[PDB]
Amino acid sequence: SASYKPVFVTEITDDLHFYVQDVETGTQFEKLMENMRNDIASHPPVEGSYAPRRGEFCIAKFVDGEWYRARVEKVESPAKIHVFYIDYGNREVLPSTRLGTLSPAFSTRVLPAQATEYAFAFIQVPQDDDARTDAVDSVVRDIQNTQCLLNVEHLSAGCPHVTLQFADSKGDVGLGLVKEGLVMVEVRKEKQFQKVITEYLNAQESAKSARLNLWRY
Amino acid sequence: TQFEKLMENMRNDIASHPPYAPRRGEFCIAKFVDGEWYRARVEKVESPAKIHVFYIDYGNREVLPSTRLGTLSPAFSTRVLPAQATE
């Protein structure tokens, strides 16, 4: 199975998942953000016209001083509201003074949340916090906030598992983590994955021999 | 797992007997974007090109054409193995 879609990778999570945007809708997103930000500058949220509730959409003012679409998760207190940036995938805890009403002109009905969560096919996320940080750091350095090609491999209990390809035919991103000894291979049993799993296990044997990262000792 | 075994058996059967009229609540098989077949339930019929399904074993939802749907054989019904994800 091979249908590669150009995506813009926006966020690598600490659990080695990632969020991507469909390159196709990138310009609509760009237009919406400029429109929305203009509005916000003319009509700044007044306190407290917005009351944060878990599940509720909003605008949130990010650390660059700019406003983005978001959705409220945990409300700890008015000083500590957990939000999820729906078009990008990152999360943040902010005070209610950095939140506002998401006006219907810029709603999810006008343009759907632009970020989709995925995981890497064929690999195991390291359980040790230190090892996992090393893997996340490699992915952040190499693909975060860049364009990639994505191929959906299969469904899973959580988000779908996919392979990513670097731009400029540099290859399979997850496989690269294996070759570097940063992650172990998940040995899939399905027939159509037999050849790719063989490729991954060979890379993993190479990392083991070279005693890289996870295989240091 | 029971699920992995069921999926292997079902896929075998579909490749040996390749495939339907979508109705709300009806069980089916649905071909996901990976080109593979999964157990699903029709949740909403917006139009022939836009059937809203729920993948009963994985929890994901998708709108797809009814050309990518098929009958779920009795050998792979929820009596055989319940939906593995909560609708």
UniProtKB/Swiss-Prot annotation, chain A:
Primary localization class, coarse: cytoplasm
Domain Tudor: 51-109
Domain of life where this protein originates: Eukaryota
Post-translational modification: Phosphorylated by PIM1 in vitro.
GO cellular component labels: cytosol; dense body; extracellular exosome; melanosome; membrane; nucleus; RNAi effector complex
Modified residues (Phosphothreonine): 101
Protein name: Staphylococcal nuclease domain-containing protein 1
Organism of provenance: Homo sapiens
Phylogenetic lineage: Eukaryota, Metazoa, Chordata, Craniata, Vertebrata
Shown residues within the full chain: 679 to 895 of 910
From Swiss-Prot, chain B:
Subcellular location as annotated: Cytoplasm; Nucleus; Melanosome
Residues recorded as bearing Phosphothreonine in the entry: 71
Annotated positions of the Phosphoserine modification: 73, 77
Entry comment describing in which tissues the protein is expressed: Ubiquitously expressed.
Post-translational modification: Phosphorylated by PIM1 in vitro.
Tudor domain location: 21-79
Function recorded in the entry: Endonuclease that mediates miRNA decay of both protein-free and AGO2-loaded miRNAs. As part of its function in miRNA decay, regulates mRNAs involved in G1-to-S phase transition. Functions as a bridging factor between STAT6 and the basal transcription factor. Plays a role in PIM1 regulation of MYB activity. Functions as a transcriptional coactivator for STAT5.
Self-association state and partner proteins as the record states: Forms a ternary complex with STAT6 and POLR2A. Associates with the RNA-induced silencing complex (RISC). Interacts with the RISC components AGO2, FMR1 and TNRC6A. Interacts with GTF2E1 and GTF2E2. Interacts with PIM1. Interacts with STAT5. Interacts with SYT11 (via C2 2 domain); the interaction with SYT11 is direct.
UniProt protein name: Staphylococcal nuclease domain-containing protein 1
Organism in which the protein naturally occurs: Homo sapiens (Human)
Phylogenetic classification of the source organism: Eukaryota, Metazoa, Chordata, Craniata, Vertebrata
Portion of the parent chain present: 705 to 795 of 910
